[PDB]
Design an enzyme around this catalytic site. Structure first.
Site, short mmCIF file in Angstrom:
data_model
loop_
_atom_site.label_atom_id
_atom_site.label_comp_id
_atom_site.label_asym_id
_atom_site.label_seq_id
_atom_site.Cartn_x
_atom_site.Cartn_y
_atom_site.Cartn_z
CG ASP A 35 41.55 39.65 20.99
OD1 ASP A 35 41.41 40.52 21.86
OD2 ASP A 35 42.01 39.62 19.70
CB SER A 199 40.95 55.07 33.34
OG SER A 199 41.55 55.32 34.83
#
Length: 330
Positions: A35, A199
């Protein structure tokens, strides 16, 4: 040193991935959910409330000659999906894919929430975010990667998740046979303890690319792709019959649909998520309403590049003095 381990979807939907981890002496092998959105290595154990164990493999520290109780240490964690667990702490030897760390904090669960009990395939979590998020008190503990970093050939790990297929986590090296083209690296903020990046924009199907900054986290521990409501609405508007359902808890679509791809930007580069990766199947057994793999982050407080996005790429988690993330197509 290096390590290399195969990671395997837990079910036919790729709801999560499990990676075998050796703990203790002699080795006890548990299948852990790696994770990159949390920083605790915790396991079902001989100390877990018996009624809360249902099929998982447990760590028994009393059978490990290298286990030592970390006196006074406790841990307690709550995840973004509402699940939780807590317990005490041992140090022991932990190996992943041939890479061994001695003195790793292994957090032994005394209590787990129902969703953990109900998932017999996940024996615990191995956190790979920054150690500043580790919950051990009163002495915060380091992640497996943080402990291994100095010994690694290069201070990196990589995630190569498969679509309906196994993939690989590598530690200490970049497998140049595992991706196409070049790796595009992008800046990371560690201010919230995550692998947080921006992004450069998105496209829906064959549509034109929209340049827009989207701050989010690279999170192998989250199944879906969670993005701003504007972006998600633009995606589902291209699927006839798709709608946001408050009763189901997100966007659903007719199972008869063919889904468009979704592209996200990494600097000047582009990662394409095929439409099929966005299909999470019937909302309930036999239903013709299917659950979408792109969902709104509006209720989270952060955008999350989960498995739906990450499995379309070869992803480098660069833990150099200034961390960065790298993405390549594959």
């Amino acid at each position: 040193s290096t390590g290399s381990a195969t990671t395997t979807p837990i079910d036919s939907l790729d709801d999560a991935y499990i990676t075998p981890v050796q703990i203790g002496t002699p080795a006890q092998t548990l299948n852990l959910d790696f994770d990159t959105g949390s920083s605790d290595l915790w396991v079902f154990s001989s100390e877990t409330t018996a009624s809360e164990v249902d099929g998982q493999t447990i760590y028994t520290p009393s059978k490990s000659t290298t286990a030592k109780l970390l006196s006074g240490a406790t841990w307690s964690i709550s995840y973004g999906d509402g699940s939780s667990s807590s317990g005490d702490v041992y140090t022991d030897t932990v190996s992943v894919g041939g890479l061994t760390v001695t003195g790793q904090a292994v957090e032994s669960a005394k209590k787990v929430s129902s969703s953990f009990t109900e998932d017999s395939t996940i024996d615990g979590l191995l956190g790979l975010a920054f150690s500043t998020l580790n919950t051990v008190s009163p002495t915060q503990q380091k992640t497996f990667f943080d402990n291994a970093k100095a010994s690694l050939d290069s201070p990196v790990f990589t995630a190569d998740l498969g679509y309906h297929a196994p993939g690989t986590y590598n530690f200490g090296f970049i497998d140049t046979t595992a991706y196409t083209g070049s790796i595009t690296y992008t800046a990371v903020s560690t201010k919230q303890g995550f692998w947080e990046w921006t992004s450069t924009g998105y496209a829906v199907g064959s549509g034109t690319f929209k340049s827009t900054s989207i701050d989010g986290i690279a999170d192998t521990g989250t199944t879906l792709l969670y993005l701003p409501a504007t972006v998600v609405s633009a995606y589902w508007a291209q699927v006839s019959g798709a709608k946001s359902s408050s009763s189901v808890g997100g966007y659903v679509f007719p199972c008869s649909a063919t889904l468009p791809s979704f592209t996200f930007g990494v600097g000047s580069a582009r990662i394409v998520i095929p439409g099929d990766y966005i299909d999470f199947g019937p909302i309930s057994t036999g239903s013709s309403s299917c659950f979408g793999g792109i969902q709104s982050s509006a209720g989270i407080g952060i955008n999350i590049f989960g498995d739906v996005a990450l499995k379309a790429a070869f992803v480098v988690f660069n833990g150099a003095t200034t961390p960065t993330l790298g993405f390549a197509s594959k």
